[PDB]
């Protein structure tokens, strides 16, 4: 089928900026590309049908554009209303397929995650189960990428991530990253890492324990 | 106005079936091609299933095919989505949605959580600290939703970030709730986390204390 691939993932804006959103798709699709708009915890709604056409009671401030395979949507004077996640959708085969999404959000300095690692409390470690918990906070963007390593073998498949909404305050997002392991094999290993790439990093960076160490 | 209400969802055991509903107002029901499209918790979009005005053509996801029946009652302004042998991997928000040109109305959402899981309280684990410090608790293997952590019994708000539950691969929730603070502070000030799971009437207030090891 016909693959939706949107850019950027984030884009930071102010409010009264002008905002272009990026959709191609994998093959033509002529103008049959709608967008739509997604808040926390509510449905999508739609804003813009056939490329470039605005649904009834959506604001002039909308508009796209393009055919084929290249498409966008623009904001022409952000409001505090339009931060949230953008989607694009093509309509010219079945299955009808979506991109990934585009989240505008409010723009603030980068902001280099404070990086902590929690070992396993001995409480959890009595049950039988390890849980280790790497936090990345107040950090902007919101693009991060979290690496487990673990006697420095790259894990995989083995971790969840959680992400704040970005917070009212100081426009930060936080991220929990949490590795869990039997306690066999979490006594198995000496060396826990979560190493942490971000915009507001040169290079990676890598808080670490060793386990029964202080 | 134009509007589609929805109900059905909740939860499901894995094997088990539900029936969502979806009802229509505000314009000819019968006139339209109507659909249903997925969000997985944390991600994008996924058309399920449509069906014609008439219910003369029916269209399926490959990941829904022979599992979800869509049908619709015209007279009653109804649609509906019988979803058998749920996996977990069906865990999402579920929409209604009218089509014209594109998707143009969509009901409210409704979540359906597959898991094996009775209700149990959570188990509370520190995460212990060692110019700022940070620490938190580890809400642990809990269902169903939601649990509420305050800190210092409502009186530090500031720097507190509790996350968002996931949905562990056991049918288990689990998130964390972490603040941080001045260092120079944890010589001298408590901070504790106060954990109320309500369902299973479980609640827990844990000190977090500064660890070396």
């Known amino acids: 089928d016909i693959q939706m691939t949107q850019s950027p993932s984030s884009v930071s804006a102010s409010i009264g900026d002008r905002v272009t959103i990026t959709c191609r798709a994998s093959?033509?699709?002529?103008?049959?590309l709608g967008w739509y708009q997604q808040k926390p915890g509510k449905a999508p709604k739609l804003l813009i049908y056939?490329?470039?056409n605005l649904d009834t009671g959506v604001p002039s401030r909308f508009s796209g554009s393009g055919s084929g395979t290249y498409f966008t949507l623009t904001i022409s004077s952000l409001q505090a209303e339009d931060f949230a996640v953008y989607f694009c959708?093509?309509?010219?085969?079945?299955?009808?397929?979506f991109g990934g999404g585009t989240k505008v959000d409010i723009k603030r300095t980068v902001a280099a995650p404070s990086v902590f690692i929690f070992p396993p409390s001995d409480e959890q470690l009595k049950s039988g189960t390890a849980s280790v918990v790497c936090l990345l906070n107040n950090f902007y963007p919101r693009e991060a990428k979290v690496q487990w390593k673990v006697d420095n073998a790259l894990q995989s498949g083995n971790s969840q991530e959680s992400v704040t909404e970005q917070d009212s305050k100081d426009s930060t997002y936080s991220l929990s990253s949490t590795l869990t392991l039997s306690k066999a094999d979490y006594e198995k290993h000496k060396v826990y890492a979560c190493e942490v790439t971000h915009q507001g990093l040169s290079s990676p960076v890598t808080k670490s324990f060793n386990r029964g160490e202080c | 106005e134009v509007q589609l209400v929805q109900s059905g969802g909740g939860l499901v055991k894995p094997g088990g079936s539900l029936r969502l509903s979806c009802a229509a107002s505000?314009?000819?029901?019968?006139?339209?091609?109507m659909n249903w499209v997925r969000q997985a918790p944390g991600k994008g979009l996924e058309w399920v299933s449509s069906?014609?005005?008439?219910?003369?053509?029916?269209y399926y996801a490959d990941s829904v095919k022979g599992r979800f029946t869509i049908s619709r009652d015209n007279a009653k302004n109804s649609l509906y989505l019988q979803m058998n042998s749920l996996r977990a991997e069906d865990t999402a928000v579920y929409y209604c949605?009218?089509?014209?040109?594109?998707?143009?109305?969509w009901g409210q959402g409704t979540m359906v959580t597959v898991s094996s899981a009775s209700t149990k309280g959570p188990s509370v684990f520190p995460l212990a600290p060692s110019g700022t410090a940070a620490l938190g608790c580890l809400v642990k293997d809990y269902f169903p939703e939601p649990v509420t952590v305050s800190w210092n019994s409502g009186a530090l708000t500031s720097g507190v970030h509790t996350f968002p539950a996931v949905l562990q691969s056991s049918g288990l929730y689990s998130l964390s709730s972490v603040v941080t603070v001045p260092s120079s502070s944890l010589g001298t000030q408590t901070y504790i986390c106060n954990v109320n799971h309500k369902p299973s009437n479980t609640k827990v207030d844990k000190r977090v204390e500064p660890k070396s090891c």
């Open positions: 959708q093509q309509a010219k085969a079945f299955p009808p397929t």
């Open positions: 056939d490329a470039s």
């Open positions: 505000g314009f000819t029901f019968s006139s339209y091609s």
């Open positions: 949605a009218r089509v014209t040109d594109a998707f143009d109305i």
């Open positions: 069906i014609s005005s008439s219910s003369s053509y029916i």
């Open positions: 093959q033509g699709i002529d103008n049959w």
